[model samples]
Target: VPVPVPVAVSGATTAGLRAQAARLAGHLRERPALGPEAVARPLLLSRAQRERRAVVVAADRDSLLTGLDALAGGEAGPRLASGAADVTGRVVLVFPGQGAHWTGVAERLWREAPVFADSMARCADVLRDLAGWELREVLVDPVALERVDVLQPVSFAVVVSLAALWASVGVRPDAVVGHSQGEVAAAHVAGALTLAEAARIVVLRSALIARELSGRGAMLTVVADVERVTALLAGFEGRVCVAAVNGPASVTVSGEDGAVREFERVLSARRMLRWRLPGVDFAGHSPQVDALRAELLAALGDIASREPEIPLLSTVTGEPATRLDAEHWYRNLREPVRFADAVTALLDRGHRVFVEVSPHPVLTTSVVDLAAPHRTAVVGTLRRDEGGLDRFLLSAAELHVRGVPVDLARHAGAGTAEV
Candidate 1:
């Protein structure tokens, strides 16, 4: 979707603002011929603009009814008629890790959807065998399975399984990325390896690091500019490092106990924004994990990975993996993830539609916020009900129609004879 071009004006009340917004919406609905030049003018609302506004208001009821009719017929409406189509873009899939998981993640799927439930059951069985615990129990009773080792693998399984299920239902992504431990899951879904092979790799990696460290580590979130956060960190003698650069104004820092305490102290003293993450240990993406590099590399070698069928964005490298093989996987494990960079790369490449496969839509939130001015969107954050899914799918269809050209006539040949 073309990001809504912001129009600035002073001395407008809430009512006036709404009126202007409505007028603008009306203008867009009528006179579809009016190009960007029409909106480029200041907020004076000329006679032509007012007339356009009236036309839009007149068509508002019809537009609403049309949308309802489209939903009922399972067809999305006419194109959004925005600038979304001017950019050739693709969909990027985002997967989450430990902190994003929760109990009953697949409860709705398990009880109501056979396809999702079946996939989850199969994947859970593999995870259970790998972790020596029932996967269902772990997801249903997450408190008892608080260890990072179990949580990481389980989260990977759930996310990958969900992606598999989505694919079975005709949902597919053009690219894939993951946050922290979620990278393993992304690799599998992106066709770097089979689900079973990817799960084994995750299990082995987690097991190797299970007992290497003890004591609590924290993931602290800061809502500020990256430069300010880096400057603040430079003054403190703490063991912390930035784990995830979530967005322009959001970042995650992880470190040892003392380092976390000191960092929190510094942030609090500076009156900078911060929040403590739960059940996170061992400063991931920092030199602290350097010791595990050798083991991770060995596991990477053992796993047979092919070049991804779809592009795989590397958070560590701030680019797409040009080659997906053993070396690439090894680099992923060793490098620090630059999530914000990856996101920027995607946006710059015109990936306006993002879908997070995991249960909770944490990554979606970050992507959406970052994409706000640019008009990108997170398709997965829509409510998890039939009505919501329908609405979201219709919106997506409309976006696709407006943003990407399709060859619908190709299907016509299938029914024709050799004439």
Candidate 2:
């Protein structure tokens, strides 16, 4: 499933195509094969803005080398790998929340992928109390799509399940980073909290977001840095602030609707109207969250946290959070998300691959932009409005191609990676 093999089975046709290749490669191993054009035919369908052509297949023993190099390098460049570990490097898995979801996000995987479906089922069961509705139902039902509480928990389940699927396939994170609601699942993946606690945190936190904080504010993605965004918000003060600094050119601004819309007007008057992010109205990661912090702290106090088995980097602190606790998560929502800084830190430590773990990718561009300077490979799991299996396997294949060591055999069988 090298088709856009998502770190989370995220975005696009690249992943979709990779999935079919993986599934068929096993079948070919079971039976027979023939023409190179037949193998090359699928490469023509790829929309990845790479090159003139691409190809794959094996006519004989060392054919694996030929196909590997030929597929990624196309006709010009080629790759030959001796061992998975030799090609592999340290990995950093990124989990993003909210804006990552689109129509049907993880729907296909929920129905067609057992490991994914089973894990989601367990999470849905755990979320029953917090969600107050069937989490699975909201995913497939159009009417329930707009509910913030439902969306947050369901999105959490999607990432957590994707994380499970990756582990089953012999891929896991050396370091994990999370933004917003994604942190709920990240904490669980890192073993800082149990699934039960994760469910509780997500449901309650989101329920409050929907009930207590709904209609109170708005958020915006400004084509500026933290300094500029902060200065723009000087007039708004406590009513508005910078939500996240994604990259050198990307920052999220948020606060009361009046303040945010006025700022949007400022951007529009400056001929940057096209840069204003639409489809978001809720103010988050700003001082407006002060209303919920006390109750949120009480809700968090009920949960337990500890040192993580895997290192967890924090967007709130812009450093490694050796231990994740209730207060940290609280501050996660109240502070600016230092995503670029976290990526730089990971890169500084020799993490050359950044995989986004989500149903659909929201952080790929930011990550690619940041990692490109450092020459790191940033992989996304799924894309908005794309096929899931192919995108996931495509990412898995890319991981292998990049020497990240993902075993495609696990995709076609029941034997797990034994992580």
Candidate 3:
């Protein structure tokens, strides 16, 4: 039995594509065995600019050929124009830190995706005994999201579940990179930490930061050159520092609130673009977090590490991490996030597709900016309000158009969804 494939066709008008669909159906019916190869080759899932289209998911030769028959007979189906978009090389999963999570972010996927829900439920079970609040409850409550401790772990859970969701569909990453707290999920997905360990790390780390670091400083997003920004902060002594190098021009600075405020005025005087990340009261990746170092290490020092099953391009060191242990985990929060450097490393190693596995994409522009001059594709799994199967399929389609094939049949075969 052939696997189910998604066949799409579209046109400017409903009547316009009917003839084309009929022709396609007739051509397929004439040679049923050739249908699967024909559909898979072109990957006719191309986006249509027209108003009318049909997408038919069929398993066997009969369903494959006949689904088009229904569409050809004027039944509802979408459009497809097959082209061999360069679907070569490996996929890299990019996980973002805070500010990616939105209330109720995982609810739709929780209902629609079994793999996603299973992973979320697993995380919830582990967190129940650790966190004072329930995982699923915090995910839906905006009040709870206000707490950094709550947001970080929930974001970790969401990204981990998303990784699971992608893997369920056979889109496992060849490599991984995590942004700040996201490293916890990346390390888990990379097999550097078990679920229990990863949960404890995120929970303990986030709680400590929230308790010890919150209100001590602030984080500023600056759209300026990195060197220029670095020099500007050098005079601040240990009061402030570069939090993250997101891209060629995008940088995040963190320091005491007063210092960050002063820097904001400097940027304003120089007519530089800068914005304080709302709801981010603590200064992560700055000296402000050093006071918690002993506490963090004490909590996570004993966490075990193993060889990564998939390579992890670590943002802390901008290199492939052999092991994600307590020291590195502590450094991940207290050091400047080398996201730009990590992407550069991945690019140098021939990674092309960068999929941001977050509820909302906070790193797309950075990935796109960093991958300049090289033909690359950056895709986000889900958006803020559009966190359902359609949005996910759109992401998969984006990857498909860019040459990273998603085996939808695997998700279908696993009885997860019909695709």
Candidate 4:
């Protein structure tokens, strides 16, 4: 990972530089991404310094020259301003519920990082009592992707494990938050519930979904702001509703399968950018959730909860939750997820760094885009179907670059923490 530093913008004032940089960034991103291009971003401003445009020039001068000599690359030498040495800032950890999995998600990490393997083993043990099947076997080779019950416990395990992995090396979150089933994992991670309690919630709650709501509806993601989607939902009415307001320009619409299919037919024909999310059948955060409301409340009411030592925000209420409770988890499944609002609320409270602590990144786009014009960074823990530990290290490195106090040495196998 290259240390990010600012390059001088010689031609424009603050507003002009911002506009030009935004456009330039967009234009550059439109082309196919190259190795150097992703790291050589000329618009990633360090929050405290730039009144105008800023760039993170990845390679140090000697490394650049030596690399060019090795790879037939070159550029004119240029002097750059001094950069922040240890870029630390407040951050939020955002977790997403489902549809973020890949078959071999924990493979490389399980082999390479003992901390990760330990977390997975620990999470699986907690899940064993509630989940009917073995979490590790499934995570090793996921199949029959339609099983919500199967997916729920495993996905929850992955999120908890990822959070443990992040915390072990010191990339601690100032705030923790999540949407959908993500709520359970977030609550558990934030000390609102015990691991066993969270596991039971995952297994029991998802079993209900599998038994009652599976194959009943589908969840579809769309790229659009809230107002437009709400206005469009006016057409579908009872047939369909918004499940999640993902970002300023993203949402997940849910309803009966036919209605969702029809909704897509109508909206897509009219040029609404949207697509159905895979691996979901139940229509959560919609009126249809009334099917499981009573039993869900009864089942989840007795789970243990405690006041948070770390700020844990809630999308269900669009504020910091006093405690994760039956009502909170129930509302999480029934109410329209106020993810965008919660992110804004956190930003309003001074959190400028957001991390998606999941095996696969689901909330990074929404958080980064909605967090707005400047001073915020969104980093992911891992990705599906990609090089594992290496990619993870790069993400951690990015967090370090944006100043999130990650202990890089731990990832390098140089004495890491258990937590």
Which is the leading candidate under TM-score? 3
Q: How do these models rank on lDDT, best leading?
A: 3, 4, 2, 1
Where does model 4 exceed 4 Å of error? 1-88, 413-419
Task: Return the TM-score for each candidate structure.
Answer: 0.69, 0.78, 0.80, 0.79
lDDT of 4 by residue, 1-419 (tens): 44322222211344443454344344434543323333233222222333332332233434322322322111222221112223335778888877787776776777766788899888878777666567777876546445888887878888888888888878777888888788778878888788898888888888888989888888888888878888878779888988888797788889999999888887878888887776788787778788798998898777687887787778788788875777777787888888888888888888888889776787788988877765776877777775365556557656654445656444332111110
Please provide, for model 1 over 136-163, each residue's C-alpha lDDT reduced to its tens digit, 9 standing for 90 to 100: 6776675755777777777777677667
Q: How far is 338's C-alpha from truth in model 1 (Å)?
A: 1.2
Q: For candidate 3, lDDT tens digit of each residue in 53-96?
A: 44455545566566567666765332222223444566799999
lDDT of each: 0.58, 0.66, 0.77, 0.69
Residue pairs clashing in model 4 are 87-403
Task: Tell me model 1's lDDT, rounded to 2 decimals.
Answer: 0.58
Q: How far out, in Å, is residue 320 in model 4?
A: 1.0
Q: Which regions of candidate 1 deviate over 4 angstroms? A: 1-88, 214-216, 322-334, 381-419
Q: Rank candidates, TM-score, best first.
A: 3, 4, 2, 1
The candidate 4 region of ten consecutive residues with least summed lDDT is: 72-81
**Model 2 stretches astray by more than 4 angstroms:** 1-88, 273-280, 412-419
| Candidate 3 deviant stretches above 4 angstroms | 1-84, 409-419
Measured by TM-score, how close is model 1 to the native structure?
Answer: 0.69
Instruction: Report clashes for each candidate as comma-separated counts.
Output: 1, 37, 15, 1
